[PDB]
Amino acid sequence: EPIWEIASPTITVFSSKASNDISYRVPAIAVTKKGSILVFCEARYGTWQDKAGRTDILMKRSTDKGITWTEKNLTNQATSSKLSYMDPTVVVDQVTGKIFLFTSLWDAVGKESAKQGYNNRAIMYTSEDDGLNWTRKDLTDEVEIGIFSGATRMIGSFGPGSGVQMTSSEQYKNRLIVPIRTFKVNEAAGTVSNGGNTAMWSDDNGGTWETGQPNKSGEWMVTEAPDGALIGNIRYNGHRQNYVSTDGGAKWPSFSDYDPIALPTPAKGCAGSVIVKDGWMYYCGAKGIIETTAHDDRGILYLAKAKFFGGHSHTFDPADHMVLYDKAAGYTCMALLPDGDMAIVAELGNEPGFQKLSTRPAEWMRLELFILST
Known about the structure:
GO molecular function: exo-alpha-sialidase activity
Number of strands: 26
CATH class: Mainly Beta
InterPro entries: Sialidase, Sialidase_fam, Sialidase_sf
Number of domains: 1
CATH topology: Neuraminidase
Enzyme class: hydrolase
GO biological process, one term: oligosaccharide catabolic process
Radius of gyration: 19 Å
CATH architecture: 6 Propeller
Domain Sialidase: 51-280
Structural class: mainly beta
């Protein structure tokens, strides 16, 4: 039985300034072949609100488990831009060591909720030199989504968080799996609606990308079980949903909701994280607290673990829950370190939840790195 511990004092990778200056949201983490940690996040200028103005995708890279860092701005939007990069989603090719990061480019400022996502573009950033340099590629028009029950679909967004490479699967060996979320297009109204989630995958180290059949919708991440089954976890209000594909991401017919006691979450939901190590599955996210007028319901970072036992069956024991932080806790992502450690990045704050103010002070949220050891 693995028993984890915060092996050091936690590191603060990103710290938000005043909401009206710049805020850092939605962290994604990846460990490169060499052993370098890459932490990606959304840089929201002038506001904290979703899809409310200009945004960049930022990355901080550390070669020494977070002691020293370098920062890069991958997107570099002109200050004039009114577009919003969102939902950084990353996967690493453990063959080539090539790193892929996916982000959705919205044109949503001012538009109504149903038309905010209409113009979304699916953007991919790849790096072949351990994160030092990145190539940009717009997949919006190369990557087609099937017509299902007559419906027109588009890529809505990704993850957020991390995908997975299928290393335990012989049938789909080394397939790169990226969690996507589709939109159903209404061409006569100019609106979009949720089309369900599926996988976007590549069997040729990212040269070509193919999609599967969507089903359930919601922010989600995906990992691979010891038996090659893809195990996803979807955000819902008050519960997490299991989301399993046994055919390499093409279809997602198996799903069930976790009891709140096994995997608790805020009443209004929050993005969580999943990963697998040595036949154990881990979920990490906010436990959820009672929201008040001052702060939301996103509090208490925790990590849960379950042992696979029937191929990819598993049961999260609440007795195996490990609390990591008692105050505000939000979006999370996880990665595996070469030395056997586990890297966890998370949104944290100092109030029991995150603050609700129109303008929120510096350090109202930070992206904190955890290093856990067995």
